[PDB]
Design a protein around this motif. Structure first.
Motif, PDB file in Angstrom:
ATOM      1  N   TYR A 126      -1.890  30.616  66.558  1.00  0.00           N
ATOM      2  CA  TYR A 126      -1.993  29.308  65.927  1.00  0.00           C
ATOM      3  C   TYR A 126      -0.648  28.890  65.322  1.00  0.00           C
ATOM      4  CZ  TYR A 126      -3.934  25.749  62.670  1.00  0.00           C
ATOM      5  OH  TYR A 126      -4.271  24.623  61.948  1.00  0.00           O
ATOM      6  N   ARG A 149      -5.062  23.454  68.749  1.00  0.00           N
ATOM      7  CA  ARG A 149      -5.710  23.755  70.028  1.00  0.00           C
ATOM      8  C   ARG A 149      -7.093  23.099  70.093  1.00  0.00           C
ATOM      9  NH1 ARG A 149      -5.443  30.029  68.712  1.00  0.00           N
ATOM     10  NH2 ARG A 149      -6.376  29.001  66.877  1.00  0.00           N
ATOM     11  N   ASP A 150      -7.610  22.892  71.303  1.00  0.00           N
ATOM     12  CA  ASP A 150      -8.932  22.290  71.455  1.00  0.00           C
ATOM     13  C   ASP A 150      -9.970  23.025  70.605  1.00  0.00           C
ATOM     14  OD1 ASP A 150      -8.250  20.251  73.198  1.00  0.00           O
ATOM     15  OD2 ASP A 150      -8.593  21.472  74.989  1.00  0.00           O
ATOM     16  N   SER A 157     -14.279  20.032  69.334  1.00  0.00           N
ATOM     17  CA  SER A 157     -13.850  20.905  70.425  1.00  0.00           C
ATOM     18  C   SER A 157     -14.545  20.612  71.751  1.00  0.00           C
ATOM     19  CB  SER A 157     -14.085  22.373  70.055  1.00  0.00           C
ATOM     20  OG  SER A 157     -15.473  22.650  69.941  1.00  0.00           O
ATOM     21  N   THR A 201     -12.519  18.543  74.146  1.00  0.00           N
ATOM     22  CA  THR A 201     -11.198  19.014  74.598  1.00  0.00           C
ATOM     23  C   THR A 201     -10.248  17.821  74.441  1.00  0.00           C
ATOM     24  OG1 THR A 201     -11.666  18.340  76.892  1.00  0.00           O
ATOM     25  CG2 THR A 201     -12.254  20.576  76.262  1.00  0.00           C
ATOM     26  N   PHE A 245      -3.186  21.282  73.412  1.00  0.00           N
ATOM     27  CA  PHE A 245      -3.133  22.684  73.825  1.00  0.00           C
ATOM     28  C   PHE A 245      -4.571  23.144  73.991  1.00  0.00           C
ATOM     29  CE2 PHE A 245       1.351  23.642  72.941  1.00  0.00           C
ATOM     30  CZ  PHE A 245       1.693  22.596  72.096  1.00  0.00           C
ATOM     31  N   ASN A 246      -4.829  24.036  74.943  1.00  0.00           N
ATOM     32  CA  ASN A 246      -6.193  24.507  75.112  1.00  0.00           C
ATOM     33  C   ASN A 246      -6.438  25.793  74.322  1.00  0.00           C
ATOM     34  OD1 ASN A 246      -5.351  26.761  76.751  1.00  0.00           O
ATOM     35  ND2 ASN A 246      -5.264  25.383  78.518  1.00  0.00           N
ATOM     36  N   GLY A 259      -3.983  28.525  74.018  1.00  0.00           N
ATOM     37  CA  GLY A 259      -2.724  28.178  73.389  1.00  0.00           C
ATOM     38  C   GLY A 259      -1.726  27.660  74.402  1.00  0.00           C
ATOM     39  N   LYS A 298      -0.132  24.816  77.021  1.00  0.00           N
ATOM     40  CA  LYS A 298       0.057  23.372  77.059  1.00  0.00           C
ATOM     41  C   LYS A 298      -0.783  22.719  78.150  1.00  0.00           C
ATOM     42  CE  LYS A 298       4.862  24.086  75.673  1.00  0.00           C
ATOM     43  NZ  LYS A 298       6.286  23.963  76.094  1.00  0.00           N
TER      44      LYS A 298
END
Lengths: 427, 427
Positions: free
Chosen positions: A30, A269-270, A276, A279, A283-284, A287, A289
């Motif tokens: 993170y 991140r998502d 969530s 999405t 970033f998913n 982590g 891109k």
């Protein structure tokens, strides 16, 4: 600089921030992304009313300061969020009314701002004060019921507590110029400017989804507000589906308005997102891109067939086959459907309308083929400005095996090397 | 009937089953789907070696029986899985080798089959005995090291234990005829059949993904084994991405071979899958029927513009607009992109190549519009054979408001009533 979002935004004097949750500051994946990509930070919950004053007159800045300190130590400014709001109020504040509540509000504002005096770049003084019913008026809350002039009072109080911080009014569903709520907010800021009420900025949360989609007139809304003499900021940006085009459009809208200070996405991140399921971020979960990340970066930096640079030949599906598992190759370019690739907003490279460029693994040597489109990350790609095509799931580059250049040369995934057999151009 | 998978398969004398996990039988959402849709059951883990014989000579059928009792109480037949395998062996068995292991194998078969004597339709006697190295030979395991004849002995033993059960050999990656593994298995069965070794069926696990995709020659593979005098069955079906065409293709292959007993999908909902990340099943996490579900049902039952029947008009995007949030309507048909819809394997109705028919809610009156495609269940539809179009997420039908029929009539989501304003034909 222009390899990171924050740095690409700084080139034009703007910033690119995110919302930080103190609870995740222990997650190494993170913080690695957050410290590197953003130069602006908003505490997701730590600076809210219930978090800074649990008990009437008893202030607690533990969580807020943890986020503030992390931000400053890592080169980011901070947006204060938020001082007066109908939501998430402490138990005691909910049980108040009249001048009593009006007084508590004032005390809270002086308490929080006093603690962070001169350390906060922007403060969301008042949050979500207007209704969604479609009237364009104030929403019914304990704060509104203490006097319609409460918002004005909050701002006058804030200005006195810390004249160094920019004072913003923050809200959602005020991005589309034609909506009644947008007009309600506009008229208020308009009035405020004329009567000398101290307001410096208007924050547009920008929570876009199919229920409240992005509309190009968002730029007009930003320009109209900026024309009133206030700065504008995109404060909690997230887009359902994370469309690359939409993310780019929003960025360009801010870049087109000199008064637009910057963009803040609501999360890293998502999986960190309050939504969530959509999405909606850059970033998913891993982590890595997403395609949208590349579109936003290119937008910040820059204000069909796919041909290999090293070979001069085109990405081709052998004999115009449509069977899943068929590995793609290089072949003399020509206007055939088996050479026409469409790059979708989701980040896919589609051929035949419903077949997707597919990676059957994540390591070097993985063969690149076509397979039915279903949304896997191994079917999503990033078209970098340098000409490379990177797989989202693997982080590897499209590579013409052994650097071959003749017809029939196969395509695979391989660690990016900036080689000419890994550089492509769209025609 | 023909409204459920099991009932539809029975119309051709076949079955359609699933794998059941005893730990989930307490979940009413899980069991509702399971008992309704399937007429054949395989215990996902409860009948494996470690679960049935935790200590040498000490058999335990408490887990297996919970699955069995549920199955028969709900009118389902049962497939036994599995009696001899190199994987999931109890610790005490992993420590054995040579003749001691060989005898333990025999003892295990007699114990488990004796308990379920006469109650099981099919037994996967031996599971995954062949290698994936590309040699087409036997997998190296403690069982194979007891002697090459271990598979034969396992089958002869099983036949004597329960003469009423069909004895199957089960494996994966033996679906494509050209693979060496497939042909290695073919030769073993041919050998067994010539020497009189008791084997009644061959189970093709059929776990398909982009690394090991479905190939149309699978039908010739099935015919070739059937020609040997054994029945064939798809035992653990799942398809990465759950493509509708692929699911329908596999179903039709089984329907084309008189000796294909039926099909079993490896799990109920995507979330119940050992590969949930690939969403390879027929029901989503919410328990909703996916686009692939309808593709299978239609194939079992024997199975451009979108014109409404009651109206006689085509689904139309107003003014050929491409703005997200644009509500769709009815309008005089005519060749125009804004009336051309593509139904994808994922179950989307695309327009303009990258825009999707999108539902902005899940209840009646919900506005049906176009929005950037991203894969949400609110952008997925099921095209029923009755002419209705159901939203995967809401379970509601495309409805022409108030039953209107003129140009400009708006499309919404409404309880499916099979009205003429909810029926559509493909043009």
């Amino acid at each position: 600089a222009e390899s990171t979002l924050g740095a690409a935004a700084a080139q034009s004097g703007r910033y690119f921030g995110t919302a930080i949750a103190s609870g995740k500051l222990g997650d190494s994946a993170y913080t690695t992304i957050a410290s590197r990509e953003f130069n602006m930070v908003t505490a997701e919950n730590e600076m809210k009313i219930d978090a800074t004053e649990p008990q009437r007159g008893q202030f607690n800045f533990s969580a807020g300061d943890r986020v503030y300190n992390w931000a400053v130590q890592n080169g980011k400014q901070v947006r204060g969020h938020t001082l007066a709001w109908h939501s998430q109020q402490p138990g005691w504040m909910q049980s108040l009314s009249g001048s009593t509540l009006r007084q508590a509000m004032i005390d809270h504002i002086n308490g929080v701002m006093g603690h962070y005096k001169g350390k906060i770049a922007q403060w969301d003084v008042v949050n979500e004060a207007f209704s969604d019913d479609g009237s364009g008026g104030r929403r019914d809350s304990n704060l509104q019921r203490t006097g319609n002039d409460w918002i004005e009072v909050a701002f006058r109080t804030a200005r006195a507590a810390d004249p160094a911080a920019k004072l913003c009014y923050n809200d959602y569903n005020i991005e589309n110029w034609t909506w009644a709520k947008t007009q309600g907010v506009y008229n208020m800021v308009r009035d405020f400017k004329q009567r000398g009420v101290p307001i410096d900025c208007v924050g547009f949360q920008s929570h876009f989804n199919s229920g409240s989609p992005y509309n190009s007139n968002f730029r007009t809304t930003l320009q109209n507000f900026a024309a009133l003499g206030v700065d504008v900021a995109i404060t909690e940006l997230d887009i359902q589906g994370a469309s690359s085009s939409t993310y780019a459009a929003v960025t360009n809208d801010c870049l087109a308005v000199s008064r637009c200070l910057g963009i803040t996405v609501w999360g890293v991140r998502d999986t960190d997102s309050w939504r969530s399921g959509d999405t909606p971020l850059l970033f998913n979960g891993d982590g890595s891109k997403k395609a949208a990340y590349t579109a936003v970066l290119n937008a910040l930096n820059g204000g069909g067939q796919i041909k290999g640079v090293g070979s001069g030949r085109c990405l081709d599906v052998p004999n115009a086959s449509t069977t899943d598992g068929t590995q793609v190759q290089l072949y003399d370019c020509h206007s055939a459907t088996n050479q026409q690739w469409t790059y979708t907003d989701a980040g896919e490279l589609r051929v035949y309308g419903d077949k997707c460029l597919d990676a059957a693994g994540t390591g070097n040597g993985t063969k690149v083929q076509i397979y039915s489109c279903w949304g896997g990350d191994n079917q999503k790609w990033r078209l970098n400005s340098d000409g490379s095509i990177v797989g989202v799931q693997s982080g590897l580059c499209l590579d013409a095996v052994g650097g071959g250049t003749a017809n029939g040369t196969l395509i695979q995934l391989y660690s990016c090397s900036n080689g000419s057999n890994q550089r492509w151009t769209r025609t």
